[PDB]
A and B are shown apart, each in its own frame.
Chain A
Amino acid sequence: PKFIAVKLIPKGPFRDIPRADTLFGAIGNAISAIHGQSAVEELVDAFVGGARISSAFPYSGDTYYLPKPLSVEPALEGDEEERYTTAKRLRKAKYLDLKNFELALRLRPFTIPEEIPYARVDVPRFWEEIRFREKSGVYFLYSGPREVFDGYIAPAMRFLGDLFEVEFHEMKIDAPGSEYSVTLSNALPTKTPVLWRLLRKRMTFIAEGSIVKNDPGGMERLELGLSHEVYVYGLTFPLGVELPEG
């Protein structure tokens, strides 16, 4: 399927690569400041309706990176010294280039990005930031109706711009038709998933790249006591993935 990739061009360093729950959060708060809670409700409805945003991922110029699907971790076996060494390095890699991502989905051979377009500095005194390489930033995907992108996602992203500046392009990801799918977003699962890495925030999220079988994820609204019922985004951004038997 084809999607809208929101590209964040940074005006200096970033604290973290924002993931879907904190992206929706940021967009939610931005909409409440522009169009009141009425619009936030129309946004949650649109998203519950079938609309999805991915977590943020690195881009370097004209290269779109995507999370390594956990589908491959078991199948890596499918020279001893080369085999052990390669397997560990592929295991360690957290991202694959789009070209190679589309391969890993079909359990065909693929290669890793050599240098990743960011490096976590940690200035002491301590805490750390993220230094972005030249013409390298972060992006996230939106699948849904355009009138929801134009009405909410787009204006919110500009508002949040004012540390970064925003442009968006059309993007295509060839993904095999399958019973199984990868999430491109951290998700609060409904059903027990196939393969996953947990993520602690308190909430228990499945990480990006984790594999689910027909699981849309869910949203959660809770009364913190902050006067407006806050929504936590936990919907799955599914792309079909071929699996090895076992």
Chain B
Amino acid sequence: MEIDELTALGGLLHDIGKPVQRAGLYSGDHSTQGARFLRDLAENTGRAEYELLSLFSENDELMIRRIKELSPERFGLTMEDVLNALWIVYEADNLASPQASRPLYSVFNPGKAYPWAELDFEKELPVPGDVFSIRSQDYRELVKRLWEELSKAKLRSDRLLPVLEKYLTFVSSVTSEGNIISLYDHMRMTSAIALAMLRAGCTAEDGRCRKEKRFLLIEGDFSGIQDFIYRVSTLKYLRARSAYLELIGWDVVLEILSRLGLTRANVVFNAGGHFMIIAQNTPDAVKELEEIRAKAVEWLYREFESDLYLAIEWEPVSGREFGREGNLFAEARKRLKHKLTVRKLKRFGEIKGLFECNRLVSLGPKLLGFGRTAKNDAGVLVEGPFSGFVPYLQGGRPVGEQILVKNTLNPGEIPESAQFVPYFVADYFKKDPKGGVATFEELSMASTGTRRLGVMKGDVDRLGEFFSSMDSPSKLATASRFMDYFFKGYIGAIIEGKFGYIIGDVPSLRDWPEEPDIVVVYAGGDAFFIVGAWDQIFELAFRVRRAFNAYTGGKLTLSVGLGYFDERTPIYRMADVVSERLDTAKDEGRNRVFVVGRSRPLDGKHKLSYEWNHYEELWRTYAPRIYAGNGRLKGKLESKKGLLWKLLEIRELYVRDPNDVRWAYLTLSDLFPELVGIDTKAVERKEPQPVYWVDGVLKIVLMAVR
């Protein structure tokens, strides 16, 4: 072992006492009980390193003697070193910062709490419901699986994080009321902060690291992503562009960790082109950041000629600022944000000489991950600023100092020396008759009624605020991950048709298929871009928004723009139009979907957008009376398909002038009793007539019947 690996593993295992206390066992307090778990484990298999790492959960009299008994020379460590490793990790626990059965209360809604289960994308949607005690059995089952994994684990932080993430993700780090922080997140943010303090060179400090700017907050944000992906020259290709952006971002992050000698625990978050890292504030570091930032931008400039820029900034921050005094952390993030905004108005300033497509076709099914190697290496299919990426297939061998493995937390059969970097991505796609991904043409052909491609852009409303209200690194970590994982993790499931009970009864035109005609372009961070058969995409929007309502405490809200285009429309226009429709739903207040393009009066009283609940209710009311399902109108309206069309031309003589009462004059008459009468509360509330809203249902029905 070495001092750096120890301190990382030291912060990462400090609070592994908590789950063993909760399951019973050593009958001690979590501190003492954690020591007895690792010491007992160490003796089993016979890996003494754990007995060294057991000292973390516990006048320095006994401590020095207990350390001395354990040979520090055996692991090539100094006695004086290990005292630092303990004190450092001790303070690290305080900076990232009571019955036993208390569960993890949602970051999205502290009122509701998560029922114990291990992180599994396949095994159901995390829905924060009613507060239930977790049994002293569920924890016993946890600790035994946990013990079994740690036995076979290789004892590097990259092989320890994935098993801590599997099992301790849905566990309250402290068992108090309305505790929001996942244990995994507190553990990695103590490993993160601890290692920083070591690399910062501060030692025997009981506040030189605490009340001094010995840390760096490193936030990295790509800009012009929309142009890089959706504005060039096919779906196969446009998918690979989104995948290339993921690898490029990783190539930068991993490089930053590599050159600052930090671990993946130091990656506070990395979602949707936005990443944050905590690090040391050594002159050696800021130099290595200035070197990296430059060599990245130069490469991004050479490669894409200003379409894609990477804005990296860092701020000197102290232990004080990771916590609250009377919320410093948010205010340290704000001063870093402002730094970034400024840098984005200086795109490619890191180039003084500024003022003087076959590899993505062969990259656009069968692979498990990618090998981060040198550029000059055989088999390298794509290259980022710092490293080539060698595709890693099922039957093949992984190649490179780091291996990126897709949609698992289990290394699998990879070499013991290789660093395990897990990455999740939403990449659901309707398979063709051929093994390849469906085309805009194949998708549009599949749709009920009209043959149009369906496009939906979807963002989360006022995320900036939600994240700004996080006290501590560990909180922000639990916030980011749970957010990212909804889109990266569960959108796949949602498309498959899972969680019917959670999201039942949403507007739909056909029965939901086994192999839906959908292709995810992106699904990560707080946003998603998905295309498919227009009627299936229309329904998915309501499914996704319902799942997200449940996945949050009904406390966060989506806005969605929908689009139904001729298959032969260019990618760039469809994007521009759904984009225009999305930020229109947000502008018209938030928590609302743009369902279909609409004529309206330009009197500043009439919103193109519908509130999710408004539309969901409108559909429940009208659709069952007129629509039978799977492309077929109601038998009553066969030979009357026009009575619908006549209401559209009726609503138009309300759009012409919403003060003209002619639409009363014009109005079986039993069908649609809501519209015929002149609404009055709407005239007082300064709101539209029911007539204004209906088209949103009818137009969609008429598209499904043609």
* Interface residue ranges, A against B (CB under 8 Å): 70, 73-74, 77, 80-81, 84, 89, 122, 188-192, 195-198, 200, 204, 246
Known pairs A74-B345, A80-B465 / 5 extra A-B pairs, C-beta < 8 Å: A73-B341, A81-B462, A192-B349, A195-B342, A196-B345
Rounded to whole Å, the gap between the CB of A122 and the closest CB of chain B is 7
- Given contacts A190-B355, A204-B355, A246-B338, are A197 and B347 in contact (CB under 8 A)? yes
- Given contacts A81-B462, A200-B306, A204-B354, are A74 and B338 in contact (CB under 8 A)? yes
B440 on the A face (CB < 8 A): no
For the complex, give the distance between the alpha carbons of A200 and B309 in Å: 14
B144 on the A face (CB < 8 A): no
| Chain B neighbourhood of A195, CB < 8 A | 342, 345-346
For the complex, give the distance between the alpha carbons of A200 and B345 in Å: 16
B348 on the A face (CB < 8 A): yes
Per-residue 0/1 for B320-358: is the Cβ within 8 Å of any A Cβ (1 yes, 0 no)?
000000000000000000100110011111001011000
- Residue on A nearest B570 in the bound complex, by CB: A126
- Given contacts A80-B465, A81-B462, A189-B355, are A200 and B305 in contact (CB under 8 A)? yes
The listed residue (A74, A191, A198, A204) touching B342 by CB distance below 8 A is A74
* Interface residue ranges, B against A (CB under 8 Å): 305-306, 338, 341-342, 345-349, 352, 354-355, 462, 464-465, 573, 587
A70 x B355 contact (CB < 8 A): no
| Chain A neighbourhood of B464, CB < 8 A | 84
- Residue on A nearest B577 in the bound complex, by CB: A122
Rounded to whole Å, the gap between the CB of A82 and the closest CB of chain B is 12
Rounded to whole Å, the gap between the CB of B606 and the closest CB of chain A is 15
- Residue on B nearest A199 in the bound complex, by CB: B306
- Given contacts A84-B464, A198-B347, are A246 and B305 in contact (CB under 8 A)? no
- Residue on A nearest B341 in the bound complex, by CB: A74
5 A-B pairs in the complex with CB atoms less than 8 angstroms apart = A77-B338, A84-B462, A195-B342, A198-B347, A200-B305
For the complex, give the distance between the alpha carbons of A21 and B349 in Å: 23
B465 x A198 contact (CB < 8 A): no
For the complex, give the distance between the alpha carbons of A246 and B335 in Å: 11
Rounded to whole Å, the gap between the CB of A92 and the closest CB of chain B is 8
- Residue on B nearest A75 in the bound complex, by CB: B338
- Given contacts A122-B573, A198-B306, A204-B355, are A73 and B462 in contact (CB under 8 A)? no
A198 x B348 contact (CB < 8 A): yes
| Chain B neighbourhood of A84, CB < 8 A | 462, 464-465
| Chain A neighbourhood of B348, CB < 8 A | 198
B355 x A192 contact (CB < 8 A): yes
For the complex, give the distance between the alpha carbons of A125 and B346 in Å: 39
For the complex, give the distance between the alpha carbons of A192 and B465 in Å: 35
**9 shortest interchain CB distances as A-B pairs:** A195-B345, A189-B355, A198-B306, A70-B345, A74-B342, A198-B347, A200-B306, A73-B345, A84-B464
- Residue on A nearest B468 in the bound complex, by CB: A80
| Chain B neighbourhood of A196, CB < 8 A | 345-347
Rounded to whole Å, the gap between the CB of A164 and the closest CB of chain B is 27
| Chain A neighbourhood of B462, CB < 8 A | 81, 84
For the complex, give the distance between the alpha carbons of A197 and B305 in Å: 14
- Residue on B nearest A70 in the bound complex, by CB: B345
- Residue on B nearest A74 in the bound complex, by CB: B342
Rounded to whole Å, the gap between the CB of A176 and the closest CB of chain B is 20
| Chain A neighbourhood of B342, CB < 8 A | 74, 195, 246
| Chain B neighbourhood of A81, CB < 8 A | 462, 465
For the complex, give the distance between the alpha carbons of A178 and B355 in Å: 24
Task: Tell me which of A70, A122, A204 has the highest count of chain B C-beta atoms within 10 A of its own C-beta.
Answer: A204
| Chain A neighbourhood of B338, CB < 8 A | 74, 77, 246
For the complex, give the distance between the alpha carbons of A88 and B462 in Å: 11
| Chain B neighbourhood of A70, CB < 8 A | 345
Rounded to whole Å, the gap between the CB of B336 and the closest CB of chain A is 12
For the complex, give the distance between the alpha carbons of A78 and B341 in Å: 15
Rounded to whole Å, the gap between the CB of A208 and the closest CB of chain B is 14
For the complex, give the distance between the alpha carbons of A246 and B465 in Å: 24
Rounded to whole Å, the gap between the CB of A12 and the closest CB of chain B is 23
Rounded to whole Å, the gap between the CB of A78 and the closest CB of chain B is 11
- Residue on A nearest B344 in the bound complex, by CB: A73
For the complex, give the distance between the alpha carbons of A81 and B465 in Å: 8
| Chain A neighbourhood of B345, CB < 8 A | 70, 73-74, 195-197
Rounded to whole Å, the gap between the CB of A25 and the closest CB of chain B is 21
Rounded to whole Å, the gap between the CB of A23 and the closest CB of chain B is 22
For the complex, give the distance between the alpha carbons of A80 and B330 in Å: 14
For the complex, give the distance between the alpha carbons of A198 and B462 in Å: 29
| Chain A neighbourhood of B306, CB < 8 A | 198, 200, 204
For the complex, give the distance between the alpha carbons of A246 and B305 in Å: 28
| Chain B neighbourhood of A246, CB < 8 A | 338, 342
For the complex, give the distance between the alpha carbons of A74 and B338 in Å: 7
Rounded to whole Å, the gap between the CB of B604 and the closest CB of chain A is 9
- Residue on A nearest B602 in the bound complex, by CB: A115
| Chain A neighbourhood of B346, CB < 8 A | 195-196
- Residue on A nearest B305 in the bound complex, by CB: A200
- Residue on A nearest B583 in the bound complex, by CB: A92
The listed residue (A89, A192, A198) touching B352 by CB distance below 8 A is A192
For the complex, give the distance between the alpha carbons of A208 and B513 in Å: 52
- Residue on B nearest A122 in the bound complex, by CB: B573
| Chain B neighbourhood of A74, CB < 8 A | 338, 341-342, 345
- Residue on A nearest B354 in the bound complex, by CB: A204
For the complex, give the distance between the alpha carbons of A189 and B351 in Å: 14
| Chain A neighbourhood of B349, CB < 8 A | 192
Rounded to whole Å, the gap between the CB of B315 and the closest CB of chain A is 12
- Residue on A nearest B573 in the bound complex, by CB: A122
- Residue on A nearest B347 in the bound complex, by CB: A198
For the complex, give the distance between the alpha carbons of A97 and B3 in Å: 62
For the complex, give the distance between the alpha carbons of A200 and B587 in Å: 30
Rounded to whole Å, the gap between the CB of A128 and the closest CB of chain B is 10
| Chain B neighbourhood of A204, CB < 8 A | 306, 354-355
- Residue on B nearest A92 in the bound complex, by CB: B583
- Residue on B nearest A189 in the bound complex, by CB: B355
For the complex, give the distance between the alpha carbons of A81 and B589 in Å: 11
| Chain B neighbourhood of A80, CB < 8 A | 465
- Residue on B nearest A188 in the bound complex, by CB: B355
For the complex, give the distance between the alpha carbons of A246 and B352 in Å: 21
| Chain A neighbourhood of B587, CB < 8 A | 89
| Chain B neighbourhood of A188, CB < 8 A | 355
For the complex, give the distance between the alpha carbons of A77 and B305 in Å: 32
For the complex, give the distance between the alpha carbons of A182 and B236 in Å: 43
For the complex, give the distance between the alpha carbons of A142 and B338 in Å: 36
- Residue on B nearest A215 in the bound complex, by CB: B355
| Chain B neighbourhood of A197, CB < 8 A | 345, 347
For the complex, give the distance between the alpha carbons of A122 and B573 in Å: 10
Task: Tell me which of B345, B348, B352, B465 has the highest count of chain A C-beta atoms within 10 A of its own C-beta.
Answer: B345
For the complex, give the distance between the alpha carbons of A89 and B588 in Å: 12
Rounded to whole Å, the gap between the CB of A120 and the closest CB of chain B is 10
Rounded to whole Å, the gap between the CB of A28 and the closest CB of chain B is 23
For the complex, give the distance between the alpha carbons of A145 and B341 in Å: 40
- Residue on A nearest B568 in the bound complex, by CB: A124
Rounded to whole Å, the gap between the CB of B410 and the closest CB of chain A is 40
- Residue on A nearest B566 in the bound complex, by CB: A124
For the complex, give the distance between the alpha carbons of A198 and B351 in Å: 13
- Residue on A nearest B307 in the bound complex, by CB: A200
Task: Tell me which of B305, B355, B462, B465 has the highest count of chain A C-beta atoms within 10 A of its own C-beta.
Answer: B355
| Chain B neighbourhood of A198, CB < 8 A | 306, 347-348
- Residue on B nearest A114 in the bound complex, by CB: B604
Task: Tell me which of A188, A197, A198 has the highest count of chain B C-beta atoms within 10 A of its own C-beta.
Answer: A198
| Chain B neighbourhood of A192, CB < 8 A | 349, 352, 354-355
- Residue on B nearest A200 in the bound complex, by CB: B306
- Residue on B nearest A76 in the bound complex, by CB: B341
For the complex, give the distance between the alpha carbons of A7 and B348 in Å: 36
| Chain A neighbourhood of B352, CB < 8 A | 192
| Chain A neighbourhood of B355, CB < 8 A | 188-192, 204
For the complex, give the distance between the alpha carbons of A190 and B345 in Å: 18
